[PDB]
Amino acid sequence: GPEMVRGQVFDVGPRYTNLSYIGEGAYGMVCSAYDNVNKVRVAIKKISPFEHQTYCQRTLREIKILLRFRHENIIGINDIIRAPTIEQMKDVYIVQDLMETDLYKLLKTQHLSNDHICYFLYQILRGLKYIHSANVLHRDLKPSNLLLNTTCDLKICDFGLARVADPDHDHTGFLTEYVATRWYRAPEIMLNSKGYTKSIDIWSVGCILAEMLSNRPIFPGKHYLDQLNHILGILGSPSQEDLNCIINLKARNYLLSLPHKNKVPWNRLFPNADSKALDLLDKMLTFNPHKRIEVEQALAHPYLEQYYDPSDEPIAEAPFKFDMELDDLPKEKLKELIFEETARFQPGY
Ligand SMILES: Clc1ncccc1Cc1nnc2cc(-c3ccnc(NC4CCOCC4)n3)ccn12
């Protein structure tokens, strides 16, 4: 029989064996395994999306995007397993090289040296530079999606929430609401919920930096609307100028009705942190998304000057365009597209 992990069948034999639980989500589970053919340890992400259009969209995007990415700081896809015919396909298994841990687990057991924080942050932004150069938004950057080895190599994973946004088109009003994980959500995800940009990823990285500095989430909102109150509790109330940049009248009136909060100085929250790290943190956690530092400027910041080197920081040679966005289709058509995108890993073809 096929191996089972916590009640989930993993139909990945005979090539992949010795499965161990790593984690799970609403419609998927990840296990470690052994690749008997290449004699290497792998992670396998089982995805079962086909009953819901949104799940199918996210499965197709993760596959299409990662199959076209090749970058040292981004998890690669080794192999994709699914049934030989579309009717039998209920699950898709994405196979990746196995990393030792993630940043979420590391921060449970270790206080990081400034050198480790600096080097980890560089690698995050080095991978993000490549992602953003491809016109992709990751939209769910957080410690558990940053994979780590003992060599301190870092790789970004889980592109289930990622998508392409062709800059030739205005995506205002067409972007999915309620993206990112709550504590890592930029304010405009709540105040401009269908019209944010790739700068929400920079905000997430800022939340990650703060978490590396103190081993605690900086904005641990208890529910969706509580999240904005945590953000404003530290940044203080938005300036008049920043307010009048919120185009949504409803969101702008909601903000005008909040009680005034003063800014908490960064070095009061992080009194032992590198002042350069706090300066970069401040620019990444900037309320106004258009004033927020962009990925290349973040790499060029004094905090990262031991590592910044554009001659060794690849960008995408064919940035993605609208063709990568054609997924507002019935889930039955998306299943056909997923079948086609994964056909290159099938015997025959
Ligand atoms: Cl968990 C989950 N479940 C359902 C949906 C989404 C997700 C999140 C998610 N997506 N892709 C992935 C990939 C991986 C992965 C890839 C390579 N090496 C390792 N090594 C582990 C070993 C134990 O320590 C943590 C690192 N993990 C992890 C989570 N991943």
Side-chain angles (χ1 to χ4, degrees), residues 22-25 28 30 43 45 75 96-102 105 145 147 157-158:
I22 287 173
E24 66 190 89
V30 179
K45 175 178 187 163
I75 198 71
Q96 313 169 324
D97 290 336
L98 179 72
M99 296 296 273
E100 285 167 65
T101 194
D102 63 50
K105 289 167 159 194
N145 287 333
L147 308 169
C157 72
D158 192 359

Side-chain angles (χ1 to χ4, degrees), residues 21-32 42-47 62 66 75 96-103 105 140 142 144-149 157-160:
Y21 178 81
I22 287 173
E24 66 190 89
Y27 58 106
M29 167 188 296
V30 179
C31 287
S32 68
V42 299
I44 304 180
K45 175 178 187 163
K46 170 183 189 191
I47 308 169
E62 173 156 53
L66 286 180
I75 198 71
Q96 313 169 324
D97 290 336
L98 179 72
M99 296 296 273
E100 285 167 65
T101 194
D102 63 50
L103 184 64
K105 289 167 159 194
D140 198 17
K142 57 180 174 171
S144 67
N145 287 333
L146 304 177
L147 308 169
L148 306 171
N149 283 345
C157 72
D158 192 359
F159 286 65

Side-chain angles (χ1 to χ4, degrees), residues 10-13 16 44-50 59-60 63 67 77 79-95 334-349:
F10 267 71
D11 212 357
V12 301
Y16 305 101
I44 304 180
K45 175 178 187 163
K46 170 183 189 191
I47 308 169
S48 316
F50 296 114
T59 305
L60 180 64
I63 288 174
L67 286 180
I77 289 179
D79 189 18
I80 302 178
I81 292 162
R82 47 79 163 158
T85 79
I86 183 146
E87 298 75 21
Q88 294 148 254
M89 188 168 65
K90 309 276 166 206
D91 314 289
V92 182
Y93 303 88
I94 298 176
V95 186
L334 294 171
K335 180 185 188 167
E336 295 178 0
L337 296 177
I338 289 165
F339 196 75
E340 301 171 31
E341 276 296 307
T342 62
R344 54 164 280 195
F345 296 98
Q346 292 290 129
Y349 167 78

Side-chain angles (χ1 to χ4, degrees), residues 102-113:
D102 63 50
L103 184 64
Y104 169 86
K105 289 167 159 194
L106 191 57
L107 292 173
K108 302 282 211 35
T109 42
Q110 329 254 327
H111 301 303
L112 298 179
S113 73

